[PDB]
Amino acid sequence: VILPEGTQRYVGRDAQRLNILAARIIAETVRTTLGPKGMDKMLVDSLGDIVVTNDCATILDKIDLQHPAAKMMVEVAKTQDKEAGDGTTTAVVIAGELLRKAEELLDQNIHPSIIIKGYALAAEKAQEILDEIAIRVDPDDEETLLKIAATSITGKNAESHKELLAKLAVEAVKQVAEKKDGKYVVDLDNIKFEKKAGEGVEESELVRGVVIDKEVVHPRMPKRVENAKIALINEALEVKKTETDAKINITSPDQLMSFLEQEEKMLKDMVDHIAQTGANVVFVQKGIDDLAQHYLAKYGIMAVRRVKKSDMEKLAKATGAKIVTNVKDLTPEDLGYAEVVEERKLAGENMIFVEGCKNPKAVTILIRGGTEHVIDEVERALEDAVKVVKDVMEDGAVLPAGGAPEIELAIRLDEYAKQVGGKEALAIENFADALKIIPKTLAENAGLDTVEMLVKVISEHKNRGLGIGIDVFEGKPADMLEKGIIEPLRVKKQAIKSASEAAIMILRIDDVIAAKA
Amino acid sequence: VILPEGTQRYVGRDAQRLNILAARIIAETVRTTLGPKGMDKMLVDSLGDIVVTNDCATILDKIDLQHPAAKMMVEVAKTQDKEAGDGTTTAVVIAGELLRKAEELLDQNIHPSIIIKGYALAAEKAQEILDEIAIRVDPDDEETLLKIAATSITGKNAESHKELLAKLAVEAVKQVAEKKDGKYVVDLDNIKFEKKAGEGVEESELVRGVVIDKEVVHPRMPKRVENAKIALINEALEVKKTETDAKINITSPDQLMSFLEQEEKMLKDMVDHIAQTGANVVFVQKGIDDLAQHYLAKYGIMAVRRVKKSDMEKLAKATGAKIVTNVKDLTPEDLGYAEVVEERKLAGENMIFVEGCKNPKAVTILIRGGTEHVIDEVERALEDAVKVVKDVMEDGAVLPAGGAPEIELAIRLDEYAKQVGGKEALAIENFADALKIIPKTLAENAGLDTVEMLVKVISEHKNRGLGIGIDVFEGKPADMLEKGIIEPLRVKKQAIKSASEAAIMILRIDDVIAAKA
């Protein structure tokens, strides 16, 4: 034929209008979750599985979006979550709003070219305004670092114990943190989250070490060790074999017994190499023969087999131990330390706690909660609580919350609009207006008077200053700095980046050609 | 069941959303025809019938609207066309736009109550402002009446001879106009339109009488009468019969003859009663026997039968003759005068022209054109032309064209908003901004830069005063007064009532319940 049937195409206004609509819809879908008063969503996938969350990234990810432009709105939250860790909603909402105001200009007949260029200037000029107004704080200031973490947790469900969770999140990042070049660098992978139902979120805590979901491989081995000298062996503690094909040919009765002992020996020899280093705790990545388990047990050594590669590494980093491939070359220096290593039946489940390490470079947070739901949402809160603390240590720059930065950006970006002037100024004025959905949908979700509320806030801000924003807990504008309600200078900078990029990306597509969706 | 199935329903956001959207769609369908540059639409009905026009009223009507809120938009053009006769498109567009700016306020969470109240104040205050700025003129000032007529014809197809047509229109309304109470009063029904194909719109002329589409009932009757004495008879010129059932019983041969003669006599006795008044031209509403015809012929009288009651009434006002029910009581005080009455074969189509009438109180405008479409559209042009000339003679007030009044209204109404303040001020301010679609879409249909051109006009007007509007032929702002381009103060006053009412009616519906559409 001439072109695949069932393949639709849209051009000009059509393409743009739809893409913008799609994006806007998806955006309004998540805006009901913005801020402390935000509502939750219930996602029921095709396999009955139920996900109840406040998290934008999860919602957009779990929801089966079909329209292309709406799938692009997912990337926005994806990039946000991966760069600043928080403000995923903020970015998606601003992206849709930007796209709405952008259409107003299109209807008005302004060339897409002009709108794009104006958004760029408004965007670039926006970063500038933020870097400048950013309250530069001390990279490791316990004080402000606790606030950043708590303000992040006060946006989701588990805000009932923002106290504890913030403490743990700040604590856990300071521990695994790294600063040998002047400024900090935080590899968050060095923080494992352990979730176990039962108890209360009150029982959640920081394990300065690692928690592994395995058990002691043999009955006779110790279930607890005081000052453990841990050995990390990534080798199969079993009867080795030659690469070259080989088979034993018993020719006389006494051979049956000799060969078995030959292997017992081999097995007992490897275990000896491990006992000699003075190790009383061994984590093996591969398997462990039964006989090897026997000798290991006699020496009063605690061993666990089939340890997850990712677990091995966290043990190495938390105990100071060294992973080895050959037991023969194992030395006491390869061993690591843990003030206590014990198997505990937490919720009828057997887990091993490698706690009380010297100075772990990897640490674990144990999350406790009444239901799977309570837990999964607390973990989601901590991951943001942690990702933001990480941003402040590497950045040493914070901003007030409650739309305060967007209000400032709006007011300011409008002046800039004037000096730019022309068609461009229209785009720059619209872009600056768009930034208001944050303060807007913030008081909205809180059940306040949008229209009226936004007028007092743009007033106070113009009067009192940059620290003025909306306080959904106050129902009135307030100095967010005085209330410690702040957020990473990176969260805003990345939201603005992602949003405008998306907005502009769509504003540039003048034709859509799809086949089956 | 509970509520009939196949019955849909919407509430709140849903209802309004869908109603506003439906209205807007309709509005934007006709907006491409606004102004002199506007475009025509081709409408093909279910029966293959073709209609090409620029008229909103015709379009909204021929197009089969299905959605409820969209049919209510047809009511707006209907009200307008039966009150000011012009600006049907204008009323609709301002209505849709008035709704669009209204949804923006709903989204902002403003109670529909507040918006309606605000739109009411704006609409009320606008009649007031129009009344004020209105340029009072002389009820019969031949001058401004010729402009108003041509400014109207210009905005349509026919603007190619706005000269001739605007003349025929001002001339024809002055002739049939009435005024015995101090002020004029025009009954447009007294102006008949005669459409006939062939020639050019150039041959279109005013007939100070009436054109009728009938023939001279008999071959030997006069095809022309100089100073005609006209008789208007609404009685059948045929052998009357008794209400009481009756039948003749011929009993002897001589009776066949004797009876036929008794009828001839009855027939002739009537033709006599007519000839004796001096009437040389007879118009009969009912039928005419063949003998009654032969007599009228022999007396040199010209007769026409089966004349439309509506045509009889027009001849009554045009020749000053009186309609009579009984020929026996026909006095010559009942005859009428027409300078010439003749049967012309206009396009192979025989017709009777009754021209040269004394002071006709009813007249006829004959239209000529190449195609059926040319004529129909010329007729439509003349109807608005006549209808406007009527508003001025009755109203004695005009306004500048090109969206000048709406621009003045926009500007002033905003100030009013300021002084009214509150949430309503937002409704009022929006209403004011809404009015800008006329200049906006006027320039747009012209091919001008909307955004830019609209800044120029709001400027000039803001400086050079009320007469400044946009001129699609000039492609820039001008003083509409100096250009002579104007419209009736009624056209704008009605467009506002019509549109604002429609808008408020829709804004009030919070629930739609339909069974099959």
Place this chain on the structure above:
Amino acid sequence: VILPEGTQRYVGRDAQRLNILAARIIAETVRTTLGPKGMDKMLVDSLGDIVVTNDCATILDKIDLQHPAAKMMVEVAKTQDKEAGDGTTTAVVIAGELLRKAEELLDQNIHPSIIIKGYALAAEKAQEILDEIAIRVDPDDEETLLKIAATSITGKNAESHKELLAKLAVEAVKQVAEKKDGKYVVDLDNIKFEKKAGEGVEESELVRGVVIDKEVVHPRMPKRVENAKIALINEALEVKKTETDAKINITSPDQLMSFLEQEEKMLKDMVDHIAQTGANVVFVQKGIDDLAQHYLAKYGIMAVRRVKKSDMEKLAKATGAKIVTNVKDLTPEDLGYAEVVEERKLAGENMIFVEGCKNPKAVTILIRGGTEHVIDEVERALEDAVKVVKDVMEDGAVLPAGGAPEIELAIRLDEYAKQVGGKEALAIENFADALKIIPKTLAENAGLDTVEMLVKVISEHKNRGLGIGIDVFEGKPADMLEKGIIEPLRVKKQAIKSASEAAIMILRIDDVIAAKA
């Protein structure tokens, strides 16, 4: 079979549960139209037809309820509209509400019997409490009568002219009103409503006579009579025939004429009989032969044929004329007087106005307006306005509005519940509570804080007194008496009566058996 398949049946819990649901659903549908701030609904019948209203009665009637318990809710509005004309929404709401609280008591396992008996006691005590607190007024006090009417018109669309319309209604009812037994008695059938599109609701006038949609039958007759002596003839002015079959047998030529003349004569003598009374205006219920028209024209008499039987009686009551079956007995004492009877062409349509009547016992209200919808709704407003004025003149007792009565009934009916005690007390308490949906949905439709508002109002009322209610225009509690916002003591009495009976009726159905719906 045993019982037709497709015959659903419900019992006890089920039956009552569903009935109460269907009842409440209907109730909630209309409660959004309660009060001055209420919304309108758009009704689209399967044939396309569009109806936009605020009138509960029209909505319940237009919608196609299918459920039995829902249809019963239409009867509530019907009875309300026929006993007090206003408060149709109020009764349907308090009914569904009563059913809601009633089920609460059913779930508590209280026997339907008890709920029914407690509701009857609450209902009974209600009237009593209403008669007592009712503010007795002077049956014809022009003041309170003008309020009642405006207070009523304010609760619908056309409140933009609560002023004009209220006047027209108090006036129209004071006229046609009758009272010879001491107290008043109004027959609203003597108030015809005439609706014609065009103009504004401003030109609405009270024709102290009758407007008829017919025209002067003959051309040569007067289209206007100064001091009319009117004849109401219910007889056909045409050649009478015998009951006994008959037919004329013409035998000689001279007969064709002698017979026609004999009929002309018959006809003429009928007209002579009418002329001899001095009558210049004739209204004939039946036909009017052609000749009969001609003779009537010569005498300079204005005649209209085919007048509606309903119209004839209005003419008889307005002009004082007496309908006559036989022209032969028409005497001058049968004629009636009208200061002016003229054929005016209102809204392009010919009509006959009979105004300036002596002391009309029947009067017409002419309604003007832009669209058909503005018209129909104004009429609905007026019918309620007329009907409330009627209640006060007959009752001579009023009450404050904005829920003031219901608040008083709630507060009071509770103490009554105390003295009754037992399960009954629970039914009585719930009944007293249900009555709050009025103040409740009144503030709710306005957009006020339902919960908080309903507490300020019960407080004030407990303090200031019976006149304390909600003023949707004030957004706060107010003394409705000092405000002039009042309603007929009958409307409230009838609401309780209606609702409680409807409720008790359903509370009594323990089994439902249906075949197809």
